[PDB]
Design an enzyme around this catalytic site. Structure first.
Site, short mmCIF file in Angstrom:
data_model
loop_
_atom_site.label_atom_id
_atom_site.label_comp_id
_atom_site.label_asym_id
_atom_site.label_seq_id
_atom_site.Cartn_x
_atom_site.Cartn_y
_atom_site.Cartn_z
N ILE A 141 3.77 6.20 -12.91
CA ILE A 141 2.88 4.54 -12.71
C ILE A 141 1.25 4.49 -12.16
CG2 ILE A 141 4.82 3.83 -11.90
CD1 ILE A 141 4.20 3.66 -8.99
N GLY A 142 0.67 6.10 -12.20
CA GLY A 142 -0.09 5.53 -11.87
C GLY A 142 -1.10 7.46 -11.63
N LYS A 202 3.19 10.67 -4.51
CA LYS A 202 1.85 11.05 -5.00
C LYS A 202 2.01 12.89 -5.12
CE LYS A 202 -3.11 10.83 -3.99
NZ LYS A 202 -4.57 10.75 -3.08
N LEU A 251 3.01 0.14 -3.53
CA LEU A 251 2.14 -0.61 -4.02
C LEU A 251 2.11 -0.93 -5.68
CD1 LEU A 251 -0.19 0.71 -1.20
CD2 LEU A 251 1.72 -0.97 -1.07
N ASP A 261 -15.14 6.77 0.87
CA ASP A 261 -15.25 6.66 -0.84
C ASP A 261 -14.61 5.32 -0.85
OD1 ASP A 261 -15.71 6.80 -3.46
OD2 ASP A 261 -13.96 8.50 -3.73
O1 LIG Z 1 -2.39 7.55 -3.10
C1 LIG Z 1 -3.32 6.93 -3.11
O2 LIG Z 1 -4.98 7.86 -3.43
C2 LIG Z 1 -3.18 6.56 -4.71
N1 LIG Z 1 -4.45 7.18 -5.35
C3 LIG Z 1 -4.43 6.16 -6.96
C4 LIG Z 1 -5.24 6.63 -7.54
C5 LIG Z 1 -4.93 5.82 -8.44
C6 LIG Z 1 -3.69 5.26 -9.67
I1 LIG Z 1 -3.44 4.20 -10.70
C7 LIG Z 1 -2.76 4.84 -8.39
C8 LIG Z 1 -3.02 5.76 -7.26
C9 LIG Z 1 -2.13 5.34 -5.96
N2 LIG Z 1 -1.04 4.50 -6.51
C10 LIG Z 1 -0.03 4.38 -4.60
C11 LIG Z 1 0.61 3.46 -4.66
CL1 LIG Z 1 1.67 2.81 -5.78
C12 LIG Z 1 1.75 3.73 -3.64
C13 LIG Z 1 1.18 4.71 -2.25
C14 LIG Z 1 -0.21 5.19 -2.25
C15 LIG Z 1 -1.05 4.85 -4.00
C16 LIG Z 1 -2.54 5.37 -4.95
#
Ligand SMILES: O=C(O)c1nc2ccc(I)cc2c2[nH]c3c(Cl)cccc3c12
Length: 342
Positions: free
Chosen positions: A32-33, A55, A108, A154
Site C-alpha cells: 500500500i505504499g 513498514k 492509515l 521533515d
Molecule cells: O511510516 C511512515 O513514514 C510512512 N511513510 C510512508 C511513505 C510513503 C508512503 I506511499 C506511505 C507511508 C506510510 N504509510 C503509512 C501508513 Cl498507511 C500507516 C502508518 C505509517 C505509514 C507510512
C-alpha cells in the site's frame, strides 16, 4: 543474482507476496505504499484480530539505523500519549524478519499531497485548512514537551496522513530524520520547499523550524501550490525574500552562510546578491486572495471564506513565518490565535 537468500530484490527491498504468513501471526495482504526507506504493506494481525500497516525497512545498514532512531522516538512519544490524542502515528510493536526491521502501525489512508491532487491542485477549503492547522499545532505542542523536545525536521504534506479519506483527522509520520533538542547532530535538514531560514543560513536551530514548515504547508493546503518552490538553496532563499523581504540585519550579521545569498552594503544594511520580484513585493495578501475571493478568485460566492476569516489566517501564517526563531509563534500561542476562535 541472489539477494538475501532470494527474499530481496536488487533495491534492498523485501519481495512482497500476497497471502504470505509471517511468524504465525501476520497474513500479508498487499503493498500500500513505498518510499526511500522500503515498503508499507497492509497485513492482518491474527493475534489482535485487526488490520495493520507494516513498514518493512530496507535490508541495508543506513536504512536500518535510520529506522532504529525512528523506533526509539516513536516509543518515547507513544508512551506519553497512551490515549492517542496528539496526532502522532501509533507504533504498536516492531520486529526483525528475514533481515528487515518491521514497524507495525495502525492503518492509515493517504497523505495531504494526495489530498491536494484530489482537489486538482486547487486547494482545500479554509475550514478544512483550519482543522489541519489545529491538529498540527497540537502535535507540535506535544513534541515541545520537555521529556520529548523532538524536532521532526521533515514536515511536508507527504508526511501528514489522513486516518480516513473522508474525514479530517490526521497523523504525522516519518521520524527517521528527527532529533531531540539536547542532541542536535544534523546541519543539512528539511525538505527544500519547507526549509527554515535559520537552516538555509547555517545557524543554530530548534523546534521553531517545524513551525516554519507548518506555515508553508498550510498556505499550500489552501492554494494547492507550494508557497516557496525553490529549485536550489539560492532560489529557495530568493523565493522567501520575494514574500517576506530581506531578513533582519541582526540575524544576517550572525549567519555563517549570509554571503551565499546576500551582500552587506557600506551603510551596514544587507541586500540580495545578483529574475525576482523586489523584496517583500509578492504579498501573502495576494497569494491568499484575502480581498479578491481567495486563491484564483475561486472562493468568491462561497461561505466560510470572508475577508475577516482570511485576515485571521494571514496573521497566523505571518507569525509562523517570522524570520526570527526566538519570536516566531510557538504552539501554545498558535492554538490561542483568533483563527481558531470559532
Ligand atoms: O511510516 C511512515 O513514514 C510512512 N511513510 C510512508 C511513505 C510513503 C508512503 I506511499 C506511505 C507511508 C506510510 N504509510 C503509512 C501508513 Cl498507511 C500507516 C502508518 C505509517 C505509514 C507510512
Amino acid at each position: 543474482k541472489v539477494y538475501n537468500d532470494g527474499y530481496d530484490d536488487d533495491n534492498y527491498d523485501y519481495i512482497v507476496k500476497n497471502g504470505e504468513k509471517w511468524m504465525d501471526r501476520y497474513e500479508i495482504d498487499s503493498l500500500i505504499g513505498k518510499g526511500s526507506f522500503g515498503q508499507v504493506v497492509k497485513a492482518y494481525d491474527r493475534v489482535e484480530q485487526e488490520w495493520v500497516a507494516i513498514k518493512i525497512i530496507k535490508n541495508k545498514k543506513a536504512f536500518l539505523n535510520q529506522a532504529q532512531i525512528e523506533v526509539r522516538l516513536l516509543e518515547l512519544m507513544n508512551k506519553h500519549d497512551t490515549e492517542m490524542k496528539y496526532y502522532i502515528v501509533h507504533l504498536k510493536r516492531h520486529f526483525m524478519f528475514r533481515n528487515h526491521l518491521c514497524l507495525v502501525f495502525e492503518m492509515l489512508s493517504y497523505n495531504l499531497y494526495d489530498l491536494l491532487r484530489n482537489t486538482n491542485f486547487r486547494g482545500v477549503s479554509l475550514n478544512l485548512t483550519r482543522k489541519f492547522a489545529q491538529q498540527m499545532c497540537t502535535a507540535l505542542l506535544f513534541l515541545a514537551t520537555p521529556e520529548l523536545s523532538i524536532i521532526h525536521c521533515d514536515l511536508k504534506p507527504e508526511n501528514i496522513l489522513l486516518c480516513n479519506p473522508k474525514r479530517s483527522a490526521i497523523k504525522i509520520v516519518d521520524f527517521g530524520s528527527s532529533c531531540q533538542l539536547g542532541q542536535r547532530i544534523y546541519q543539512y535538514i528539511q525538505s527544500r520547499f519547507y526549509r527554515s531560514p535559520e537552516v538555509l543560513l547555517g545557524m543554530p536551530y530548534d523546534l521553531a523550524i517545524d513551525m516554519w514548515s507548518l506555515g508553508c504547508i498550510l498556505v499550500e493546503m489552501h492554494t494547492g501550490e507550494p508557497l516557496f518552490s525553490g529549485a536550489n538553496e539560492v532560489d529557495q532563499m530568493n523565493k522567501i525574500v520575494e514574500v517576506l523581504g530581506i531578513p533582519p540585519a541582526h540575524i544576517l550579521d550572525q549567519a555563517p552562510k549570509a554571503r551565499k545569498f546576500f551582500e552587506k552594503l557600506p551603510d551596514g544594511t544587507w541586500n540580495l546578491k545578483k529574475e525576482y520580484k523586489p523584496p517583500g513585493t509578492r504579498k501573502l495578501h495576494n497569494i491568499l486572495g484575502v480581498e479578491t475571493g481567495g486563491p484564483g478568485g475561486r472562493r468568491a460566492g462561497e461561505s466560510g471564506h470572508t475577508v475577516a476569516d482570511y485576515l485571521k489566517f494571514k496573521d497566523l501564517i505571518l507569525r509562523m513565518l517570522d524570520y526570527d526563531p526566538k519570536t516566531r509563534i510557538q504552539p501554545y500561542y498558535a492554538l490561542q490565535h483568533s483563527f481558531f476562535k470559532k
